[PDB]
Design a protein around this motif. Structure first.
Motif, PDB file in Angstrom:
ATOM      1  N   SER A 129       0.370   1.935  -0.654  1.00  0.00           N
ATOM      2  CA  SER A 129      -1.008   1.457  -0.712  1.00  0.00           C
ATOM      3  C   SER A 129      -1.405   1.165  -2.234  1.00  0.00           C
ATOM      4  O   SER A 129      -1.108   1.668  -3.055  1.00  0.00           O
ATOM      5  N   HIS A 130      -2.099  -0.030  -2.296  1.00  0.00           N
ATOM      6  CA  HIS A 130      -2.541  -0.275  -3.538  1.00  0.00           C
ATOM      7  C   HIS A 130      -3.697  -1.632  -3.307  1.00  0.00           C
ATOM      8  O   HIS A 130      -4.200  -1.906  -2.199  1.00  0.00           O
TER       9      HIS A 130
ATOM     10  N   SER B  99      -8.521  -2.867  -1.274  1.00  0.00           N
ATOM     11  CA  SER B  99      -7.748  -1.652  -1.175  1.00  0.00           C
ATOM     12  C   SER B  99      -6.951  -1.498   0.122  1.00  0.00           C
ATOM     13  O   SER B  99      -7.720  -1.767   1.057  1.00  0.00           O
ATOM     14  N   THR B 100      -5.673  -1.742   0.163  1.00  0.00           N
ATOM     15  CA  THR B 100      -4.938  -2.079   1.271  1.00  0.00           C
ATOM     16  C   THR B 100      -3.887  -0.952   1.650  1.00  0.00           C
ATOM     17  O   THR B 100      -3.255  -0.523   0.754  1.00  0.00           O
ATOM     18  N   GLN B 101      -4.025  -0.484   2.669  1.00  0.00           N
ATOM     19  CA  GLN B 101      -2.997   0.860   3.204  1.00  0.00           C
ATOM     20  C   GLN B 101      -2.460   0.099   4.398  1.00  0.00           C
ATOM     21  O   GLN B 101      -3.103  -0.566   5.198  1.00  0.00           O
ATOM     22  N   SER B 102      -1.203   0.409   4.454  1.00  0.00           N
ATOM     23  CA  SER B 102      -0.112   0.089   5.516  1.00  0.00           C
ATOM     24  C   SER B 102       0.831   1.074   5.966  1.00  0.00           C
ATOM     25  O   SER B 102       1.487   1.613   5.186  1.00  0.00           O
TER      26      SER B 102
ATOM     27  N   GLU C 259      -2.864  -1.451   9.514  1.00  0.00           N
ATOM     28  CA  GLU C 259      -3.621  -1.587   8.260  1.00  0.00           C
ATOM     29  C   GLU C 259      -5.070  -1.310   8.151  1.00  0.00           C
ATOM     30  O   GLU C 259      -5.621  -1.541   8.945  1.00  0.00           O
TER      31      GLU C 259
END
Length: 234
Positions: A92-93, A147-150, A167
């Protein structure tokens, strides 16, 4: 599939990000809809090759579709990509977005950290530009980030080579004192995302002469910054 699935996550719809009320005036991606936008990237794998991509993201009727061409060159036969030496997971970033006044659009650059199987990190430097397809007004944003989480998974009943992707994306980086506290903006584009939207993704690729295609299906719920996609080699 000639490359590791994680390496394609970024290429395979930032219109599904959650922009909270105070930031909706910065949401270029939805504002470009339904006509859509062109998204272009160079992705440079440190010590290895590069992908260059061109996509059109737009509505076809009730469906958000993302159609892509990808060309990959200068890859090492026995490197991390073509040799499939990347772990099946994803960091995540934050992706920083700036306006690009000249193309009536946005740009971004960011680095993806891919874990190497039994080694360290394979960096993938991303350069991105997005341009609206239509001639209508769009929202050019102040500087902010997504802010992206996968999360990557497998479907235990799917026999084909595939990837399941969950996501969550939330915009941030602008405070409530911004622009004299003014939330007002046009809801054109934005209004098409208030519920669940079906997604189609289709990619044609060629990486060092290895040609392949991928299709992906699922849905987006921007109210929650949520995307669910399943991809298969075709």
């Amino acid at each position: 599939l000639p490359v590791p699935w994680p390496t394609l996550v970024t290429t395979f719809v930032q219109c599904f990000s959650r922009y909270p009320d105070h930031m909706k005036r910065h949401d270029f991606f939805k504002s470009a809809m339904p006509e859509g936008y062109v998204q272009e990237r160079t992705i440079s794998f440190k010590d290895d090759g590069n992908y260059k991509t061109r996509a059109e993201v737009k509505f076809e009727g009730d469906t958000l579709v993302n159609r892509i061409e990808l060309k990959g060159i200068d890859f090492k036969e026995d490197g991390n990509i073509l040799g499939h030496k990347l772990e099946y997971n994803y960091n995540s970033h934050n992706v920083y977005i700036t306006a690009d006044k000249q193309k009536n659009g946005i740009k971004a650059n960011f680095k993806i950290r891919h874990n190497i199987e039994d080694g360290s990190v394979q960096l993938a430097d991303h350069y991105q530009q997005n341009t609206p397809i239509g001639d209508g007004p769009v929202l050019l944003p102040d500087n902010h980030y997504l802010s992206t989480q996968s999360k990557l998974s497998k479907d235990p009943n799917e026999k084909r080579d595939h990837m399941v992707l969950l996501e969550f994306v939330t915009a941030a980086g602008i405070g409530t004192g911004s622009r004299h506290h003014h939330h007002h903006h046009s809801r054109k584009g934005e209004e098409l995302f208030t519920g669940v939207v079906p997604i189609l993704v289709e990619l044609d690729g060629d990486v060092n002469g290895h040609k392949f295609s991928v299709s992906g299906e699922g849905e987006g719920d921007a109210t929650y910054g949520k995307l669910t996609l399943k991809f298969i080699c075709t």
